[PDB]
Amino acid sequence: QTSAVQQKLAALEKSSGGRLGVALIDTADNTQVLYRGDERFPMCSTSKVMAAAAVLKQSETQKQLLNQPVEIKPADLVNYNPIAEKHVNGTMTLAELSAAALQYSDNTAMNKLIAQLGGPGGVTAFARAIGDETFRLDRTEPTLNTAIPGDPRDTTTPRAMAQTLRQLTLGHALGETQRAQLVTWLKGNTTGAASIRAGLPTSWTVGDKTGSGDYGTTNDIAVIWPQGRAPLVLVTYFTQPQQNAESRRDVLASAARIIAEGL
Ligand SMILES: Nc1c(-c2nnn[nH]2)cnn1-c1ccc(Cl)cc1Cl
Ligand SMILES: Nc1c(-c2nnn[nH]2)cnn1-c1ccc(Cl)cc1Cl
């Protein structure tokens, strides 16, 4: 049934010069649209959702964990740290680090989440525990964004990430309070208005996490609450052949618009 939407996505991809991956889940009826749904893409900062969620899972057995202070030192600053740099020689709580990672895409904050989980493999272990056999986190910030074509490190597929995002935000992979906290954080994202959201009707409510990296990699993963129907989960991943390619958030908006016009 989805051949027409898939053909429109293929035409968009052809004009973009890059490689596009899309996965939709409509949670009213679990129907789906996939485009390169089982191909691997570099996650870049979209991986911050899995790290924050893994810390939320830890907080289910430690009521005070999100209030736990974490030291920020000058040597911890990496390549984009708009929140963490204000706290150097001080501390941020795990809640503050989660909010900074998710809503501002702070890369130092992501590294503190990764360290709280015991390294990149602790994020992967959480993914496995919630049923995601595809996600892999191999490196910290900033090197997880190298996005080299053919490199499996720090990748997932659109199908797997859409299913995981659904289970984290609308399903029961997290406890109820933790799920609500993750949704609140995503809905408060500051970085998403040019990506999936730009392709959807302005009245719809969106929570999302963007990512970008080398090879012009431009990504967005979103939960969408349209008016008058059950929520959708949409992943759009895009990567290009040249290491220094520019970001193409407009391609993600165009993919989202094709999806919305097919509903
Ligand atoms: N561009 C991004 C993202 C990002 N998140 N979502 N989409 N992109 C996260 N970190 N950075 C980044 C990296 C290096 C420099 Cl110098 C500046 C920035 Cl802002
Ligand atoms: N995926 C499906 C089915 C379907 N029926 N049985 N299994 N799947 C029917 N409609 N769609 C669909 C959903 C979203 C968009 Cl945008 C476009 C389409 Cl054509």
Residue boundaries of the structural domains of the chain: 2-263
Residue with CA nearest ligand 2 atom 12? 2
Phi, psi of 108 (to 5 degrees): -65, -40
Q: Whose CA is closest to 107, among 151, 57, 71, 145?
A: 145
Q: Whose CA is closest to 92, among 118, 119, 110?
A: 110
Q: Which of 41-67 are b and which e, b meaning 16 or more Cβ less than 10 Å from the residue's Cβ?
A: bbbbbbbbbbbbbbbbbbbeeeeebbe
Residue 54 structure tokens: 């893994």
Phi, psi of 110 (to 5 degrees): -55, -45
Resolution in A: 1.4
Q: Which homologous superfamily does the CATH classification assign to the domain defined by 2-263?
A: DD-peptidase/beta-lactamase superfamily (3.40.710.10)
Q: How far is the CA of 10 from the centre of ligand 2 (A)?
A: 17
The whole-angstrom separation of Cα 102 and Cα 263 is: 29
CA distances from 64 to 95, 140, 200 (A): 10, 26, 38
The whole-angstrom separation of Cα 82 and Cα 102 is: 12
Alpha helices in the chain (DSSP H): 3-16, 48-59, 94-99, 107-116, 120-129, 158-169, 176-187, 249-261
Question: What value, to the nearest 5°, has the Cα angle with vertex 196 and ends 236 and 198?
Answer: 150
The whole-angstrom separation of Cα 167 and Cα 128 is: 13
Sign of the alpha-carbon torsion through 186, 198, 159, 227: positive
Amino acid identity, residue 111?
N
Distance of CA 6 to the CA centre of its chain: 22
**31 and 234 Cβ atoms separated by less than 8 Å:** no
Q: Is the CB of 178 under 6 A from ligand 1?
A: no
Q: How far is the CA of 262 from the centre of ligand 2 (A)?
A: 8
**165 and 135 Cβ atoms separated by less than 8 Å:** no
Q: How far is the CA of 212 from the centre of ligand 1 (A)?
A: 6
Q: Whose CA is closest to 53, among 161, 153, 151?
A: 161
Measured from the Cβ of residue 248, the count of other Cβ atoms closer than 10 Å reads: 21
- Would residue 45 show up in a list of annotated catalytic residues for this protein? yes
Q: Whose CA is closest to 218, among 52, 14, 18, 6?
A: 18
48-59 and 158-169 helices, crossing angle to 10°: 30
The whole-angstrom separation of Cα 32 and Cα 41 is: 19
